Amino acid sequence: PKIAFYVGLKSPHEGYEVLKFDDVVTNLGNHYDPTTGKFSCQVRGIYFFTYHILMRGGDGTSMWADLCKNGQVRASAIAQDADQNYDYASNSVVLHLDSGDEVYVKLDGGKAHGGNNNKYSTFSGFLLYPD
Amino acid sequence: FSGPKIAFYVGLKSPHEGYEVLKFDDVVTNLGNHYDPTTGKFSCQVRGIYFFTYHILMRGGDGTSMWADLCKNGQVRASAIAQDADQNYDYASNSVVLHLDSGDEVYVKLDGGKAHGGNNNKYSTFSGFLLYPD
Amino acid sequence: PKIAFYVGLKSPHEGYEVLKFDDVVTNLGNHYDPTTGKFSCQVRGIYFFTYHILMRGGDGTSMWADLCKNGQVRASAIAQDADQNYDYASNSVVLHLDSGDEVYVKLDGGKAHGGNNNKYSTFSGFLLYPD
Numbered sequence: 292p293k294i295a296f297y298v299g300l301k302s303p304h305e306g307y308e309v310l311k312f313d314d315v316v317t318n319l320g321n322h323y324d325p326t327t328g329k330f331s332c333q334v335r336g337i338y339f340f341t342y343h344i345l346m347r348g349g350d351g352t353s354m355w356a357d358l359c360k361n362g363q364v365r366a367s368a369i370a371q372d373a374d375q376n377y378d379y380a381s382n383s384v385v386l387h388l389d390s391g392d393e394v395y396v397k398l399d400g401g402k403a404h405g406g407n408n409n410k411y412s413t414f415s416g417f418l419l420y421p422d
Numbered sequence: 423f424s425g426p427k428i429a430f431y432v433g434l435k436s437p438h439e440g441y442e443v444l445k446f447d448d449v450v451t452n453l454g455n456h457y458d459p460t461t462g463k464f465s466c467q468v469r470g471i472y473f474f475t476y477h478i479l480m481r482g483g484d485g486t487s488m489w490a491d492l493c494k495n496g497q498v499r500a501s502a503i504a505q506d507a508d509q510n511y512d513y514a515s516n517s518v519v520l521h522l523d524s525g526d527e528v529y530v531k532l533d534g535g536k537a538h539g540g541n542n543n544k545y546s547t548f549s550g551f552l553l554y555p556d
Numbered sequence: 557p558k559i560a561f562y563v564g565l566k567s568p569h570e571g572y573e574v575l576k577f578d579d580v581v582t583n584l585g586n587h588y589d590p591t592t593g594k595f596s597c598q599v600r601g602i603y604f605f606t607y608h609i610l611m612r613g614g615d616g617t618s619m620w621a622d623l624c625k626n627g628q629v630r631a632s633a634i635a636q637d638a639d640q641n642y643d644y645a646s647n648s649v650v651l652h653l654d655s656g657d658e659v660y661v662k663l664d665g666g667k668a669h670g671g672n673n674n675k676y677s678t679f680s681g682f683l684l685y686p687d
Contacts, residue, residue: 297519431650
């Protein structure tokens with residue numbers, strides 16, 4: 292089986308519950324759902340994910356972009372801002388997934404920037420080894 | 423992960439411009455010899471799904487913003503904006519998964535800054551590999 | 557052979573010789589050894605690695621996170637934020653490994669930050685193509 296996706300933002304989005312990437316560049320298997328913002332596992336196995344978020348949140352308060360699986364943080368990234376030189380929040384993971392597990396990016400204390408033409412905020416993943 | 427084996431990882435022997443294309447000349451891995459450091463482009467011979475990632479140490483930005491773009495046949499498919507200037511560098515990075523037809527080219531281009539690195543200090547990188555052939 | 561790992565940091569660590577990631581999230585094959593901090597190849601082939609280190613200790617100097625194979629740097633990342641906050645140092649490689657080769661992250665000029673709670677600093681890798 293062949294499962295891989297790469298998605299970005301068609302406009303700035305907030306991500307209080309989930310950052311809903313809506314610019315879908317690659318979606319092999321159709322397992323990423325832009326209406327929910329989640330990648331839902333249909334093949335049990337080992338996956339790679341990576342994200343890279345351009346975050347704005349004003350002030351001088353920290354901000355985070357987390358990768359979640361089923362509501363548990365599996366990687367986190369803290370960004371400052373420093374409204375001058377923004378911040379990107381990024382990380383990468385290898386995770387084991389069961390069928391029905393949900394993987395997504397969540398924002399804490401800041402907004403994600405990007406658009407159709409400037410694909411700044413991205414999220415990708417693919418299946419490494421099926422069980 | 424079964425058919426042909428294609429993967430590359432490259433960097434800079436010295437600082438380079440890349441206004442049309444950043445020509446990484448430090449070839450660490452080049453399974454299949456499909457990255458060409460004379461053109462700075464990865465050229466697909468195997469139709470399928472590919473992962474790419476890049477991480478460019480940029481400076482020279484006066485005060486303005488600079489960009490590192492990943493292109494495919496002249497179309498930007500990912501961007502990173504870097505806004506340091508005051509002194510020293512800032513990184514511009516991204517990752518993508520793209521479908522390629524035979525003969526498509528993938529490469530990194532720069533706007534408003536210069537990529538830094540050297541065999542000494544492998545700061546600026548470009549890597550990719552085939553995930554699934556069609 | 558399914559060989560992949562994702563590891564993070566349970567507490568702040570030095571990494572002047574090797575950053576010993578101690579939060580083992582994924583370790584297919586058990587080839588990453590949290591006691592040494594090294595991933596160790598018994599299957600020769602082509603591997604992807606990526607790392608993302610949140611560092612501190614930059615006074616008026618830069619800091620580095622380097623990815624090494626058998627003592628040789630194969631990727632470097634310079635981090636320069638000092639006056640305030642923290643700064644990430646990150647990179648990705650594709651490398652051929654011989655059986656026995658050791659891959660690990662090494663720091664210079666600063667200290668890695670994190671917790672099992674604050675999962676900021678990460679290291680991941682997987683076998684792409686066995687020879």
